[PDB]
Subunit: 207 residues, 4 copies
Amino acid sequence: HYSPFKAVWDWLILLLVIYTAVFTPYSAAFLLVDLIVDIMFIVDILINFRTNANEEVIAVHYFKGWFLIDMVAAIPFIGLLKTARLLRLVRVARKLDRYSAAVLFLLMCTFALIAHWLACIWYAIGNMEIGWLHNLGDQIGKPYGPSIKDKYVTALYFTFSSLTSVGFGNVSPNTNSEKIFSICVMLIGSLMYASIFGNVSAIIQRL
Amino acid sequence: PFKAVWDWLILLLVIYTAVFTPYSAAFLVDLIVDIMFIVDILINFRTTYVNANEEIAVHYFKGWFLIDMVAAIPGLLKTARLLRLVRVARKLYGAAVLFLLMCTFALIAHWLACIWYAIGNMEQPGWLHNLGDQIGKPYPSIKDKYVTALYFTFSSLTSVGFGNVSPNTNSEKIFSICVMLIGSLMYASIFGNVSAIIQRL
Amino acid sequence: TILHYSPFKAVWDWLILLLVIYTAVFTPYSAAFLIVDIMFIVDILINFRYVNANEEVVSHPGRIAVHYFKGWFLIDMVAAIGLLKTARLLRLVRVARKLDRYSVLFLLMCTFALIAHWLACIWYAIGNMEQIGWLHNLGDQIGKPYPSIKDKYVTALYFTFSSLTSVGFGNVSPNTNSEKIFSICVMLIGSLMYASIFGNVSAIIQRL
Amino acid sequence: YSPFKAVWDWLILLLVIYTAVFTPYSAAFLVDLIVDIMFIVDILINFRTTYVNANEEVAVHYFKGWFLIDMVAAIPFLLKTARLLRLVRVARKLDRYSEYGAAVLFLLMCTFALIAHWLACIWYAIGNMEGWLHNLGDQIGKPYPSIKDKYVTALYFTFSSLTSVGFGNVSPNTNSEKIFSICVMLIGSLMYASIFGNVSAIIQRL
Ligand SMILES: [K+]
Ligand SMILES: [K+]
Ligand SMILES: [K+]
């Protein structure tokens, strides 16, 4: 567990799991390359196979430590049922002494992630039917729809604003489902802002 | 050990009271909790205590009685029920205190939501008439009129200001001065702990 | 020969600070939109009849006047007297040399409020100085087109609080160059204030 | 580090601030050789100046680590933007400025102001490439604006987005502006918090 190879390959699977977490929710939400991350995530299990509290040291371990989780994570087969891919996030779950100025990129990454997830949730809501998308259609010169890029960037925009507590006013919740989601995103924004943006301050302080 | 379990049950119950009482008074099951909250008094009668050095009648007679029974009696006069809140005040984990603080915030948002509803209702010769026009019910069920109230209250309290709700009549504007004054205090008092305890967790 | 730490001047000075608060709230409000003087002027001899640097409260009140002339007397003569009552704001400097005898939340709340007050008065002075803007647009929100004194003052206080606490409700939107630059200034001072004063609030809440 | 420099260094600080303020503003929307002269005298003053060493005691120095930048900036040759390189000069001296907190506060406020300025220039570039200028031309009664407006409203919106107020008169409404606003909200989320924690701390030092 102390090799000049384990480190580089672990950071490689880190980049690959960020790939997963950034491109499965978008894909599943908006419009619902990856075989290589499949191959690396199924090489990770065997890399555990080839690599005690009191002292130093493997196969039945995963049979009881973490396998069925990883099995339902990566297993081929409705196009919705791909959501279970997100289970791969657990790969960033149990290595947190060999992942942590890296914490700063991690914090920016997770903030952007939460913004992305809330953006796609917001898109699902606004597409489950006065709302917001009938409005975004009218703001820009696209009345009726808009291109997928316009929708995604406006969703990420509104989510990022109402998270950072600005509220530009071009995008405004106007239906009880939207308003309840807004109360929830404002709760999450209060909590996450208060925690992580004092966190970043303390990080830059100790440096 | 059962005293502690029972106290937590009654804490759930008093949160129930504080959540569903002001809503009932302003915008508008009861007996099952009122029986528990009146036998609360008999429980206080049997309940023990420790003295300063020497480790019940005069005890509760002087602790809180002229404020318990006034609310513990089976219309607006019912509002005095809110005094049950002090029940938690006497009887005070991270995963518990954080939930507590989030509950204070949600409760404050609720109280201010119903005050705002009262204020917007005292004038029908504003924001209410300036609400039913966004939503396609021009003139509004209690679901809407409550949810936009909580929406605006959370907006102003978290300092977002979305731009649908806008105080537009002097009483509303004074209410806004007040909520922003306390809200600036809340964000600078409440989130003075969510961003302060985390070193412990 | 009267002293400073007397239980008499304590209450009287709390009353005169209530009075200087009275002024600071009522002199800008007066020009922007009799006993109040005898107390402040009598304070000249109340302070006449102190403590030296490395000495006690020295008696023989003839060693008092020169010390006073050293400490604080000059602009106080303009204080104890067109828009010349603007000079009454110099009464505020009295709490300057007296602020040490107070120590706390209430001072902070009051100063946030009265800073908002001064800025409301300046915002009104700007909106009225140019005769499309903001005050010639408020008349369309309410049903007063072309507005009382109460209405204008309360909207100005509303907008000043909105900008100082970073809400921005959207019905007060600076729309001419003077207003925009004043808004740059208020947002800078707000980024200063909401930071400083409210870190102070956090610390005070910590102490208790 | 002479007393002559113990004043002329703050003088060249004012000069580099002048440049950082008037070079982007000149390149964006649209006395000079005078400041080029001071810039070219500084390097010679450094030539006859001193240099230090860790275990030892205090012309090729300019050849050592800081050579082509001071050169490429001190030439009166969208192009003159090169001058902005001069900025690095302040980095070369912060070991002596920050001794005065009463000065570092002014430094931080000027940092915030400068960032607001550069972002105002970027915002104007984005709006002027091909919007929000059409949305400005209608509030101010000048439909189609004098550069005074187009600049001060841009600085206004930039201070808004960076201070998290969002007055809602001007608002991003075309994908490029939206992405710029994402970036400005993020850079604000960084700098606001960090620099104003710094403000709280330094103002607390009294
Ligand atoms: K804000
Ligand atoms: K706003
Ligand atoms: K805002």
